[PDB]
Amino acid sequence: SIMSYNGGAVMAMKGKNCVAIAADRRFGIQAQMVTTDFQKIFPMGDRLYIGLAGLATDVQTVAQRLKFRLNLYELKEGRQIKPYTLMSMVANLLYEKRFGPYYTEPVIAGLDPKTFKPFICSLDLIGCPMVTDDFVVSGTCAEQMYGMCESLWEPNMDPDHLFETISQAMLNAVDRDAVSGMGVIVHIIEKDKITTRTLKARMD
Amino acid sequence: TQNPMVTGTSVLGVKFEGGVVIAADMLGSYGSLARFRNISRIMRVNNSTMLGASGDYADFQYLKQVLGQMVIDEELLGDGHSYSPRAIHSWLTRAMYSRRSKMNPLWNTMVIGGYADGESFLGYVDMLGVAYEAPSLATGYGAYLAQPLLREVLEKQPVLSQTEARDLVERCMRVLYYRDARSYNRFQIATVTEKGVEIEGPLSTETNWDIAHMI
Amino acid sequence: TQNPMVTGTSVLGVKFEGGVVIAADMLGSYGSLARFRNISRIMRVNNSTMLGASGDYADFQYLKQVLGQMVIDEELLGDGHSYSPRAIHSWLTRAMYSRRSKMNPLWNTMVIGGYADGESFLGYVDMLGVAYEAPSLATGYGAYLAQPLLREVLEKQPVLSQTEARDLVERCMRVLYYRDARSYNRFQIATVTEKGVEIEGPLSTETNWDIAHMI
Amino acid sequence: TTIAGVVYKDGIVLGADTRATEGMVVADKNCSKIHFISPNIYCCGAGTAADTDMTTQLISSNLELHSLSTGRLPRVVTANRMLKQMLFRYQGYIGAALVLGGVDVTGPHLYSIYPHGSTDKLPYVTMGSGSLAAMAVFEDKFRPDMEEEEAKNLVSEAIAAGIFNDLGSGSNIDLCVISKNKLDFLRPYTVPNKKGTRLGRYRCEKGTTAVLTEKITPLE
Amino acid sequence: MEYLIGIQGPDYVLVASDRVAASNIVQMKDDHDKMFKMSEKILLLCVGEAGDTVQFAEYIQKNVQLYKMRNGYELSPTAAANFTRRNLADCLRSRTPYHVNLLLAGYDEHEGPALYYMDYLAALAKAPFAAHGYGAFLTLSILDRYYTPTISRERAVELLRKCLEELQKRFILNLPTFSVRIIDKNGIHDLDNISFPKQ
Amino acid sequence: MEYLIGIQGPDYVLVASDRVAASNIVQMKDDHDKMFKMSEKILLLCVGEAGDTVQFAEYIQKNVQLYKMRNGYELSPTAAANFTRRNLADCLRSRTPYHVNLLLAGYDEHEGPALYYMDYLAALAKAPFAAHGYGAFLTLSILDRYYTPTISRERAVELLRKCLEELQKRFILNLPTFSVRIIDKNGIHDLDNISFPKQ
Amino acid sequence: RFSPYVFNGGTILAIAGEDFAIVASDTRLSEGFSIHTRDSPKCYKLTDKTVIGCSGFHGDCLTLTKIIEARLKMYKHSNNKAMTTGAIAAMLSTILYSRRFFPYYVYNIIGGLDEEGKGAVYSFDPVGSYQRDSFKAGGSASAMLQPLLDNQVGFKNMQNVEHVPLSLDRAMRLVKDVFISAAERDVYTGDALRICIVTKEGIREETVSLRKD
Amino acid sequence: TTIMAVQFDGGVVLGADSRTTTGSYIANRVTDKLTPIHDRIFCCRSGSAADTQAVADAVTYQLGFHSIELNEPPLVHTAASLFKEMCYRYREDLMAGIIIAGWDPQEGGQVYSVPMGGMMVRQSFAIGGSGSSYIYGYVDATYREGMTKEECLQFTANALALAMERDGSSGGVIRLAAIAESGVERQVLLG
Amino acid sequence: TTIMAVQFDGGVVLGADSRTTTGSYIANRVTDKLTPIHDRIFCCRSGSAADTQAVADAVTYQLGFHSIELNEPPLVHTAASLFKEMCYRYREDLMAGIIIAGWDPQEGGQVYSVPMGGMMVRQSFAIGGSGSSYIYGYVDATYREGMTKEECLQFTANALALAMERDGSSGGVIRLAAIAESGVERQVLLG
Amino acid sequence: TTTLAFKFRHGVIVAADSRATAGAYIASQTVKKVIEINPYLLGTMAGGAADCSFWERLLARQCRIYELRNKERISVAAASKLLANMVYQYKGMGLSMGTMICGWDKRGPGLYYVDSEGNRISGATFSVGSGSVYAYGVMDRGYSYDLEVEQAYDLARRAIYQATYRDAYSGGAVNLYHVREDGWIRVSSDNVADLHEKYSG
């Protein structure tokens, strides 16, 4: 598909008091890869990340546009942004191109600014929000990550088991995937600190 | 109009000495159903010229409205000047050409007959802007069917009387009733002179069916 | 048959204790016109099984002819063995699959009900050769409309009586009269037992329209 | 997606199923298809989700503006006129299957909206993909001027039949009650399908995945 | 069609284009130049629709010169690369889209050398070595076989010699002569023109 | 697609095809032979869909060998040419067409040398010189400046040298090595393989 | 116009054990946005050591099943012995290529014992290639089930996890877990589960229900 | 175009317009749309012209052959079965509006209809052709069970009158046919 | 679907089925197909629904504004002209089966018809809808010039009865409208 | 999917990957592509599984018929010829097949290449598949005629590794076959990640 032009896979999983987001590293044309260091997870303020998968041009342009409107909002108002505010802003930004749509599936993962409340949501290519409690996935491969995350998720998870669960899920679903691969970046954040790890994936 | 919904059919017109007679029928067929079997397809313009048309009848209503407004405008100028029928023919030709140039056709096929200042006039306007003069007009399938009768008699005799032309129009409309599927046995005859413009009533034809007794 | 000309509509059939009832209406619609409002759409096979069909009625006539030939042939064997309804289902399934294999599909949707040797039977045959056994079958729009009543009541009660099933079929055919454009208020009920095959007559429904008095 | 509406002796009982499938995969198990419009009027959507959501939020904004500018309770027919005028202005490109319901000074009024703009006042409507099963249950067991719990049982029965048809939901069928005085809204109404317990602990131990590069950044 | 190769080194960027401007049957121009000197340490190469290449040369080249004459100093390679990507992404969704394939070579006082990599769908990339066309494939196999980040400039030139010897052996295309630049702490130095007698 | 030339002399026919067997991106084989020795004085070349080429070579070659063993003697080039045209004309209006482009080079004791020229539409031709493909487009001009019917074989060889020198200058395909035959009163003599280093 | 195919869905699972083959499938038959039944078992007992599964278009599944039974009877009535498992795999592949230019749109998985009495799974494709693997998931829910078996059966992408041979009842818990977890998210899966177990003593069957939507 | 066949107590009553058209031009102004097969059994055709002509000729062939081999008067249901077989077996190509009618000694008057599909049914009255829908609109209004012959003549007269008046393709001339136990009485209304 | 409008000497008589369908599914079993614009003038619609509803709203707007500015009762021909202008203005997008009728103080009862094209004509009776061809087949049979009110009610009753019986899209229930000098009499019948 | 084959002084080297996807979806990682025809022939699977499988099985059948008729091992060119003839009768009907034919001859080493298009050719080096050009590049870097045993093994293994590294349709275990004068021999079957750990540094 058009979504399957550059590949892509973004997984977010909500833990007990923390939240973890991970994505792949491969960038390239339909079968010909180019590089292994393509960023798809972008920091939007502190303790609040976004994941983008799909067409890379829409990914970078939408990320810079959201950075634009985000900085204007946080400099009109000195407080930082709440995640629902980000979700409505992203839905508005997508729905402005109702008939001229970007080709992406944004995933928002962040914590509460006042409490430690975790948050996940994911959107469609026209701006349909959806909040859940277990996990959201996006990109070309879907059913693999759906099966793995419905297989291995528990409701109350210490950050180590959350990390290892999202690790095994991403590694197995990417190894079953063809057009997306070549290494995995993992961001696990919490109230105290932000942890970023890269896994030893199959480079086949 | 891309697709004509309600079409008319053939319109016949021919000059004679000091006048032009035009007659067409009264049928409002939609596809193959004769849905509107009592309509008028000839507009009586002021004193000299006269319009008859085929094709989409709503477009004909539109042009009826616009031409009536233009004629009433010049009459309320009060200057003693009217339109020659060739001026009407010129305006209508330009209108159809500028209409079709924007890729939106008016589905029409129009006959203008007018008698002004001693000289008769019989004008044709196509959808595509094709416009010319002729001593005898026949539109649609009339150009396929009754046109050789007109061209037979006009070659055999270049001028006519009023009565000969009227009977010839009667014979041609009888023929068009004989073999047109979009025809109907009710028609109106219109005639212009120097004495003015006259529209006759909804006349009929008299057919023959004696060939049906054969096998 | 590529283009279905004269289709039937939904067929309802359901097992009960020691018998199966099958009922459908009597309408031969073509396009949108109810052209044949008096037809029979249920074949009474010899003593045990019974067929109802939908789709192209000419194919139903053809299959009726072929099955009548086969049944008469085995009855003239004189050996005292007949076909089980499941054998009818197997033969019909192989026939339909051989039709669609050669890209000449029989536009039908057929319902086989039979009671033999203590056990009831209710079989389904698709145009595509998709075929299965089921406690309650509903074709065309019936799987969208009256199938939830079947799967409601059969979950609430797995076995039924003849009167309960007949009541429920009357209700479902009333509903299919309410909201199907391919329906008609004349249907016939056919039921099999161990006492034989019996087709009841051209019954009709009892409608309500008291919601029309609201705005 | 199967939304339905009904009018009992006083007001309107609305229901919906909350499985937001994206194509062929169950992508969601809990999606609010009953939307806010006003303190008296609500709306349900079907078809394309985000189009319905943006349109219903826009009309809720305009009706809030009109109501606060007016100073009194809004009318259902104004929402009907706004929705049909907007959807005809978009020429049917926006796919939005809507059910409109609220109780005005005249009383209860129920509307069905088709995405070309055709609107109807009806005592009971069904919209969505599996709406036909709920239309079956309604046309089977409706009578005029029912009671409260009879109407609730009927609506729950209809959308339950829709879930026993294809493309229902895992959900605990959402209900919504609008009366002349009392507004209610019931998300976890009735859970029929309990998820089975796990049979093995397939838990990842701490250290079963090789790490190439770790990174720690503190915060405040 | 053709391909212009862009190897990154430790403190240099080794770019190498062709000199071919053929038209569907015949080679019209055998001494063509696709090299667009933006400023004192920033280059640009272009392959695509040959009506759009000159237009990008005009637009990007002259507008970066406009920035230079306006402010007073030279751009970073990153800001110029993002400017190009932004312009392609904006001119993509119009009645006149642009279909070229770029790759960017610059050099910073702070960041040192830099390589960027475009697409006809306007994607940024920070690569060690890039690809376009079918010389894409035939270069990338050997070039990923023999890459070391700590490689010397003469080993890079030798590697390019070897790869070109492999390019002249298994193509359909002709590709006789390749022109080569290099970027250093000084700027753009043109090396000798790299042609090969085949047999 | 590829190339092959058909020069006639007074008592010799100079044919020269290529050695290329490329497939859509890369040159799979750089020493392929398209030359099919029919008999002791009759050669055959073929250009077209490369599955039909070998099948047609099978049929024609073995049926001419069959004729040789049956009647005991060698065909004229003319009757063999008409036989090939006949089989194209029969194979064309069928469910299984062949799409080949031939030229036949023979030598009679009486008629001396003779050249023929086929098509994918089954036409005979008696040419002084012809070719196929896009090298045809250039080289029939590049030869037609310098043709004399009474030309020597060394002038014809050097003319082919020059003509290849003009093919390797303005053409998009690669074509490194051309093999060369000649036919005389003795038989088929192979000249050396003609390749050129470009730069 | 008339289309020759339609998608019924279906989900076939197979696990080759050390001396066993577990084959399971749901019994749901659907079409588009409708449910035809909740009882159509995809598994079929061929011999005492061979069970085949057939998903995809259902009519071709029926026809292929009957043809396989007929050819089994031909082999037995000609050659005085039953087929092996791999011989059935080869014969099915010859059938699927014998209808090459009008293919069967049917996924096929044969589980069963070899002549050594060991577990064996033979996968297939609609055109007729095959191979002997340890585990396959056929039908609509293949992508939902392959990576979890890659984690559990293959022990793959795992670190410092030893290889225990997979027992029978642990695999039974595996099959029940994967069918429940797949019926959570698939729309072509549920309402029942027909589990077929091949031992050295015959075929064991087992009916485990699922969710009713 | 518009064809119609009505039974009564004694026999049946047939009827058609003539007006075989092509496009918007009428090729033939008067046409025998009804065709004898046996001396007591008629058929009236619609749809395509040559196709139904060939079907009627082949049915004439097989039916006359069968009736001579029986040495008996043939049945009308027999010819209906023949039209059903020849229509359905190679359908795919043809546009037949065949209505079979005729008096029978064993079975009185009968009217069968074969539409474009290939199905067969017995009716008490029949329409056919593109311009048949309107008088089909009121043939279930004006008809009463148990008519006489002259009532059927007037009935079909008013029917084909309004069909010829309203439909554009229909028109022309009225052809009627009276078949009973007694004889074949054909007449042509006009004007 | 099927709409019907008959005038008499005092006024006009309208009538419609209900049954708004989509595909083969009935979306609405009972539907107000006739629409008041002014207090003495109705219109009954066909074709697509939303198109006719938007056109009815805009015509209601302009006609009420015009009648209030006149401070006088409007003419039926005025609403006919408004429908004609708005249908012809957007005939490339609209499918309207509008029939305008109603009593007028200057001109009595009048009936105008607007089909899909955009033409406007005054008639003594009108059909409309896809299932209208049948009763259009016999409306030139049963109608008599100079009816009374009850004769027009019975006429439209049998008309809509046969249309709802025969056509598949037609059906539902019978809605009637009586407009004269005196008052507006609506009723819903079945039979 | 990418295979390669090249002959040298000491017989023929044949290697292949084992990844066979289905569109964007990997079916398996262990698809044994190099179809073992005989004790003396090797056929491959190059584009389409069932076509390569069935037609090479039919070719094995035909070669066994020939050998049992003539008491003599068949040549390589004859097998490539029969494969080309049996494939050619379905031209245009949609067979996808680009396999390779390897075996030992009385003439010695034998290397042919038969397509579904009928491109029956010999040669010295070949590479078939999507990322076949990558194997072409790194092989024609490392190719000569006088190569050694371990040199050829490392060349072919490095080639398959670079091919699976760059193209996404290639992966799984790296099989490695070696044809001698008497018969063929499996060398080894190595995984991708092991070669990445081994050869990345």
UniProtKB/Swiss-Prot annotation, chain A:
Residue(s) carrying N6-acetyllysine: K76
Induction conditions: Up-regulated in asthenozoospermic sperm.
InterPro entries associated with the record: Ntn_hydrolases_N (IPR029055), Proteasome_beta_3 (IPR033811), Proteasome_bsu_CS (IPR016050), Proteasome_sua/b (IPR001353), Proteasome_suB-type (IPR023333)
Keywords of the record: Acetylation, Cytoplasm, Host-virus interaction, Nucleus, Proteasome
Annotated GO CC locations: cytoplasm; cytosol; extracellular exosome; nucleoplasm; nucleus; proteasome complex; proteasome core complex; proteasome core complex, beta-subunit complex
Family, similarity comment: Belongs to the peptidase T1B family.
Subunit structure: The 26S proteasome consists of a 20S proteasome core and two 19S regulatory subunits. The 20S proteasome core is a barrel-shaped complex made of 28 subunits that are arranged in four stacked rings. The two outer rings are each formed by seven alpha subunits, and the two inner rings are formed by seven beta subunits. The proteolytic activity is exerted by three beta-subunits PSMB5, PSMB6 and PSMB7.
Name by which UniProt lists this protein: Proteasome subunit beta type-3
From Swiss-Prot, chain D:
Tissue: Expressed at a low level in colonic mucosa. Up-regulated in colorectal cancer tissues.
Catalysed reactions, as listed in the record: Cleavage of peptide bonds with very broad specificity
Catalytic residues (positions): T1
E.C. code: 3.4.25.1
Keywords: Cytoplasm, Host-virus interaction, Hydrolase, Nucleus, Protease, Proteasome, Threonine protease, Zymogen
Main location (coarse class): cytoplasm
GO terms of molecular function: endopeptidase activity; threonine-type endopeptidase activity
Membrane spanning residue stretches: none
Catalytic EC class: hydrolase
GO annotation, cellular component aspect: cilium; cytoplasm; cytosol; extracellular region; ficolin-1-rich granule lumen; nuclear body; nucleoplasm; nucleus
UniProt entry tagged with the keyword Lipid biosynthesis: no
Record's subcellular location: Cytoplasm; Nucleus
Record GO biological process: proteasome-mediated ubiquitin-dependent protein catabolic process
Assigned protein family: Belongs to the peptidase T1B family.
UniProt subunit comment: The 26S proteasome consists of a 20S proteasome core and two 19S regulatory subunits. The 20S proteasome core is a barrel-shaped complex made of 28 subunits that are arranged in four stacked rings. The two outer rings are each formed by seven alpha subunits, and the two inner rings are formed by seven beta subunits. The proteolytic activity is exerted by three beta-subunits PSMB5, PSMB6 and PSMB7. (Microbial infection) Interacts with HIV-1 Tat protein.
Record-given protein name: Proteasome subunit beta type-7
From Swiss-Prot, chains E, F:
Keyword Transport applies: no
Record flagged with keyword Transmembrane: no
PROSITE patterns for the chain: PROTEASOME_BETA_1, PROTEASOME_BETA_2
GO cellular component, as recorded: cytoplasm; cytosol; extracellular exosome; membrane; nucleoplasm; nucleus; proteasome complex; proteasome core complex
SUPFAM superfamilies linked: N-terminal nucleophile aminohydrolases (Ntn hydrolases)
Keywords associated with the record: Acetylation, Cytoplasm, Host-virus interaction, Nucleus, Proteasome
BP terms from Gene Ontology: proteasome-mediated ubiquitin-dependent protein catabolic process
Domain of life: Eukaryota
Any Pfam family the entry gives: Proteasome
Modification N-acetylmethionine occurs at: M1
Major location (coarse): cytoplasm
Subcellular location: Cytoplasm; Nucleus
Assembly, per entry: The 26S proteasome consists of a 20S proteasome core and two 19S regulatory subunits. The 20S proteasome core is a barrel-shaped complex made of 28 subunits that are arranged in four stacked rings. The two outer rings are each formed by seven alpha subunits, and the two inner rings are formed by seven beta subunits. The proteolytic activity is exerted by three beta-subunits PSMB5, PSMB6 and PSMB7. (Microbial infection) Interacts with HIV-1 protein Tat.
Sequence similarity: Belongs to the peptidase T1B family.
UniProt-recorded name of the protein: Proteasome subunit beta type-2
Lineage: Eukaryota, Metazoa, Chordata, Craniata, Vertebrata
Protein's gene: PSMB2
From Swiss-Prot, chain J:
GO biological process, one term: response to oxidative stress
Positions annotated as active site in the UniProt record: T1
EC number: 3.4.25.1
Keywords: Cytoplasm, Host-virus interaction, Hydrolase, Nucleus, Protease, Proteasome, Threonine protease, Zymogen
Residue numbers binding bortezomib: A49
Outcome of swapping A49T: Displays resistance to the bortezomib, a proteasome inhibitor of the chymotrypsin-like activity. Displays high resistance to the bortezomib, a proteasome inhibitor of the chymotrypsin-like activity
Reported induction: Down-regulated by IFNG/IFN-gamma (at protein level). Induced in breast cancer tissue. Up-regulated by sulforaphane in breast cancer cells.
Record field: catalytic activity: Cleavage of peptide bonds with very broad specificity
Subunit structure: The 26S proteasome consists of a 20S proteasome core and two 19S regulatory subunits. The 20S proteasome core is a barrel-shaped complex made of 28 subunits that are arranged in four stacked rings. The two outer rings are each formed by seven alpha subunits, and the two inner rings are formed by seven beta subunits. The proteolytic activity is exerted by three beta-subunits PSMB5, PSMB6 and PSMB7. Directly interacts with POMP. Interacts with ABCB1 and TAP1. (Microbial infection) Interacts with HIV-1 TAT protein.
The protein's name: Proteasome subunit beta type-5
Native organism: Homo sapiens
Gene it is expressed from: PSMB5
